[PDB]
């Protein structure tokens, strides 16, 4: 007889009708992912558009209910998730043009070829073609061609399309009572309705900027060490005081520095930790791997897995009679169905991802009692952090020697832990300024603070100053470099990969402090201690029903984000870096370029 009751009944009928459609869509997609064929290629379209029509009528009907008359927080978070109009506010012609542009950019990106016409042998595919030409090559000009020609062709056809995209998305955003597309993309960290844990859209920039300044000296010493070590490979193309060129960072764009470890190893004679050479000889297959991985989760107090998990999960490659893409995901079909489909290989990398997907499924099964719309992580960075520490705590020599992956007496020396720490740092500390700078340029361009003539000037101006990377060749306005990335061409957001790295080390330091561990934070293991698991479970069960600030405080004890635990994790390597950086030069000059002659 009131607004809250009407919304409640509406949500009841939505809930008891959405699962029977989502499940059939999930089952059809599962069967297709098993069998790559043109026979069932349209079942994805059928399931998608059936559930899409359902959702669109539901969202259209959901707008007769205002948000000012609701007092229940649960119902408010439930209704606020259904009222998001999206792109339905635009006119029919505008929506058709928008969809045409969106399809065109993706088709150009996916069917885009880059080749050297003069030499026929200089032609190769993308994966494992043009992707590995940038991963295990030590040539300068050969890397430069692949760097330049990819953006001189694919990115030069996306510029007028991206300009139309910018104007159309700005028009879309300004009609949902928003300011810009950037404000649209910052709205998922926004928290309101609670006293003492509120968060605003304009405070994210302030917090990110505060953390960046604190991080800057550690990255500065790492940057100096890496630049000094890279001088041996490229002595005639770098200046000992300037910047680092963009086409030598280990991949196409520079998101990760991992592939540089083969050249920047501190102790090259010490045998690196290895488990691929043992897994082959240990008669180790997926069945035994999963049998072992269950025990670790039972040890700390987490429950057991179900019967259908073993039967319905596909593990090893089904030969060549059929195709399957297994890009890394675990599977939750709904209605109590948990399965897994992984690319099994005999390598170091696969024990860890078994534990990782195990943790994903554990998080899924933790909040299965929440209502239909609230079955998710606290924010877009929480789900990937809880699966990353399970791999951290299982690779330690304390644990491996008890399950035998390591030798019974694999010695621990300071010539091995430094190697492990630097391998960790190359992947984690080499990406934060990259994510920061990309999102900053995106925000400023969406706000209109950069006029068109400065689209490709300010990009390199911030690149050269914040992250210490310069370009090999000058680019005028006709280019579009940011659009050459997958997430940009498919309009995906990017700040989650910045926030999750902050969250995960806070979690690990809290857990290994509570587990009563004495020694360096990088030698810690929470197995055989149920207190750490019981502490993580209380956060895991919450789901989306609480703000993320409260979720963070319930485990660590602080409502904000901090870099002190990360700096403490890396302090043993920080001391070594400072000791090794006594005679070098620390800092970079912004007035240098490789083509300024």
């Amino acid at each position: 007889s009131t607004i809250e009751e009407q919304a409640k009944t509406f949500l009841d009928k939505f809930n008891h009708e959405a699962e029977d459609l989502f499940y059939q869509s999930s089952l059809a997609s599962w069967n297709y992912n098993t069998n790559i064929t043109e026979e069932n290629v349209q079942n994805m379209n059928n399931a998608g558009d059936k559930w899409s029509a359902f959702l669109k009528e539901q969202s259209t009907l959901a707008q007769m209910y205002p948000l000012q008359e609701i007092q229940n927080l649960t119902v408010k978070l439930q209704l606020q998730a259904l009222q998001q109009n999206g792109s339905s506010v635009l006119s029919e012609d505008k929506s058709k043009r928008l969809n045409t542009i969106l399809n065109t950019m993706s088709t150009i990106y996916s069917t885009g070829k880059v080749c050297n016409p003069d030499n026929p042998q200089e032609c190769l595919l993308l994966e494992p073609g043009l992707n590995e030409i940038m991963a295990n090559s030590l040539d300068y000009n050969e890397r430069l061609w692949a760097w330049e020609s990819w953006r001189s062709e694919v990115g030069k056809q996306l510029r007028p399309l991206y300009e139309e995209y910018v104007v159309l998305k700005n028009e879309m955003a300004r009609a949902n009572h928003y300011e810009d597309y950037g404000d649209y993309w910052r709205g998922d960290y926004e928290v309101n309705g609670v006293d003492g844990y509120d968060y605003s859209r304009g405070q994210l920039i302030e917090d990110v900027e505060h953390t960046f300044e604190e991080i800057k000296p550690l990255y500065e010493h790492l940057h100096a060490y890496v630049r000094a070590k890279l001088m041996n490979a490229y002595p005639s193309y770098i200046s000992p005081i300037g910047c680092l060129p963009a086409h030598l960072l280990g991949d196409m764009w520079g998101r990760f520095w991992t592939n540089l470890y083969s050249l920047t190893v501190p102790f090259g004679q010490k045998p690196n930790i290895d488990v691929t050479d043992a897994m082959v000889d240990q008669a180790w297959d997926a069945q035994r791997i999963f049998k072992e991985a269950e025990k670790f989760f039972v040890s700390v107090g987490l429950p057991n897995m179900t019967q259908g998990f073993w039967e319905n999960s596909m593990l090893t490659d089904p030969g060549n009679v059929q195709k399957a893409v297994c890009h890394p995901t675990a599977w939750d079909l709904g209605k109590g169905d948990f399965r897994i489909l992984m690319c099994t290989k005999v390598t170091m990398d696969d024990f860890l991802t078994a534990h990782h997907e195990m943790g994903h499924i554990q998080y899924d099964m933790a909040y299965a009692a929440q209502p239909f719309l609230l079955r998710n992580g606290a924010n877009e960075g929480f789900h990937e952090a809880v699966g990353e520490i399970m791999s951290l705590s299982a690779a330690t020599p304390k644990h491996l020697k008890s399950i035998g992956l390591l030798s019974p007496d694999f010695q621990e020396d300071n010539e091995t832990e430094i190697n492990f720490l630097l391998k960790q740092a190359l992947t984690i500390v080499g990406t934060l300024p990259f994510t920061y700078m990309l999102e900053k340029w995106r925000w400023m361009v969406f706000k209109g603070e950069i006029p068109k003539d400065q689209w490709m000037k300010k990009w390199w101006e911030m690149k050269r100053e914040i992250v210490g990377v310069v370009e090999p060749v000058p680019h005028d306005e006709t280019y579009c470099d940011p659009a050459s990335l997958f997430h940009v061409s498919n309009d995906y957001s990017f700040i989650r990969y910045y926030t999750r790295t902050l969250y995960q080390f806070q979690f690990q330091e809290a857990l290994c402090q509570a587990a009563k561990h004495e020694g360096p934070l990088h030698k810690c293991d929470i197995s055989n201690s149920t207190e750490a698991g019981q502490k993580l479970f209380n956060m895991l069960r919450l789901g989306k029903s609480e703000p993320w600030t409260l979720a963070l405080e319930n485990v660590v004890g602080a409502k904000n984000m901090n870099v002190r635990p990360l700096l403490n994790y890396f302090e043993p390597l920080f001391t070594w870096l400072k000791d090794q950086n006594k005679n070098s030069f620390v800092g970079w000059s912004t007035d240098w370029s490789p083509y300024a002659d």
Partner: protein
């Protein structure tokens, strides 16, 4: 003495719906519950007021065998002192129940690939059902005060909903074949005794 026909109560190929639960009157037969314990298939065997050991020495006037199908994580609502979508709209148990609730899995029998949508339950109702009554209707439910005259429109819905039973559902949603043996004592001779 003939064998009490528990086969038509325990191994029938098709059963009833919860909102239209079938009710079988068992009288003047020698029911044998000793084989029930050793079946090694009963996922749930709980008796309130009586015990399995005492079940073979007590003779009862009548046996109401109410038989239906529900999800697995819902048999707990078939008990005195429970709340949910089934304890108030479909089938409720009085606080003074003196019988047994027998439930076992039937995943591979009452399920088919592609779905089995022959079982239904109520979703919306204006009130709550008092003990031991059943209501069957297809009337239009009015959420607000418009009103609506037989048309599914603005806050007007259809109250019946179907169970999506399939081979691969989780244990919480798998079909459980529930028989609620309602022991009761009346003013009539008792010969339903093992």
């Amino acid at each position: 003495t003939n064998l009490c026909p528990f086969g038509e109560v325990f191994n029938a190929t098709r059963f009833a719906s919860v909102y239209a639960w079938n009710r079988k009157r068992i009288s003047n037969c020698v029911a044998d519950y000793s084989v029930l314990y050793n079946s090694a298939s009963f996922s749930t065997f709980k008796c309130y007021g009586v015990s399995p050991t005492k079940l073979n020495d007590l003779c009862f006037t009548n046996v109401y065998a109410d038989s239906f199908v529900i999800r697995g994580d819902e048999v707990r609502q078939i008990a005195p002192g429970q709340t949910g979508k089934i304890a108030d709209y479909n089938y409720k148990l009085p606080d003074d129940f003196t019988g047994c609730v027998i439930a076992w899995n039937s995943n591979n029998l009452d399920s088919k690939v592609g779905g089995n949508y022959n079982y239904r339950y109520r979703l919306f109702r204006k009130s709550n059902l008092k003990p031991f009554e059943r209501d069957i209707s297809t009337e239009i439910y009015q959420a607000g005060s418009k009103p609506c005259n037989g048309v599914e429109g603005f806050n007007c819905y259809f109250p019946l909903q179907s169970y999506g039973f399939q081979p691969t559902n989780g244990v919480g949603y798998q079909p459980y074949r529930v028989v609620v043996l309602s022991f009761e004592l009346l003013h009539a001779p008792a010969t339903v005794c093992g």
